[PDB]
């Protein structure tokens with residue numbers, strides 16, 4: 001919409017008050033003109049027709065409980081945009097400042113959130129398993145990271161390349177959680193998962209087996225469910241990313257940790273320069289070793305820790 005840039009105020013899913021970039025034209029719209037070609041948040045109105053209506057508000061105040069999922073989707077899209085821009089010099093998901101569009105209130109009791117090829121889509125959850133999915137910055141950054149992958153490596157969403165595609169999104173969603181710096185950790189979705197139970201989540205990167213996911217190649221899932229285990233086998237690569245960053249000894253193999261910033265640099269470079277649509281785990285290992293070599297030199301601690309982390313998860 002054509003109008004003026006304004007600043008609204010509202011409350012997110014977890015009751016935190018935040019400022020949001022809006023656009024004024026008769027109504028105040030959730031359209032942030034300050035980042036790239038805009039961030040636009042829409043109301044799907046409990047239906048599944050997309051995108052729905054650009055979110056309109058009469059007074060630029062977003063404190064109704066109905067407002068909360070839109071507040072967070074809009075705000076966390078902006079945080080994710082800033083993470084890629086300030087940390088990776090990447091402008092939006094296509095690298096050319098493409099508009100970021102998100103719809104909330106998708107369907108009824110929908111316990112999921114996804115990138116549909118053109119935009120973000122968040123369910124409200126059923127109140128039991130999930131609360132509104134845009135309340136988790138790691139969920140928002142996970143799903144936007146699929147857009148990044150689609151425009152770069154284009155890893156096919158099946159078998160090994162699919163598990164890489166999933167792991168990359170868990171990794172960058174976690175790094176965005178740390179960048180924003182509010183109660184960060186190495187689990188996925190804890191802020192929106194099961195309002196009745198402390199300390200759980202959908203997935204753990206530090207300990208994938210906590211929720212049934214393999215933490216070593218010898219334990220890979222080889223069936224056909226979940227597109228050949230894209231959410232299951234991502235645990236192997238998540239654990240390797242965790243070891244590269246934090247360090248540790250895993251099945252007897254010791255890894256010197258190099259920290260989150262270098263992990264991000266290494267995996268961003270592999271993603272955008274070395275991985276291809278059909279890459280398997282062993283090709284991810286080579287890409288990450290080549291990335292660390294370009295960035296830090298062939299004799300570096302960084303390269304040595306990458307090799308150790310992949311050794312620890314059984315990937316040669």
Ligand SMILES: [Ca+2]
Nearest residue numbers: 057059061062
């Ligand atoms: Ca209002």
Ligand SMILES: [Ca+2]
Nearest residue numbers: 182183184185
């Ligand atoms: Ca957290």
Ligand SMILES: [Ca+2]
Nearest residue numbers: 138187188189
């Ligand atoms: Ca988390």
Ligand SMILES: [Ca+2]
Nearest residue numbers: 193194195197
């Ligand atoms: Ca919980």
Ligand SMILES: [Zn+2]
Nearest residue numbers: 142146166169
């Ligand atoms: Zn995903």
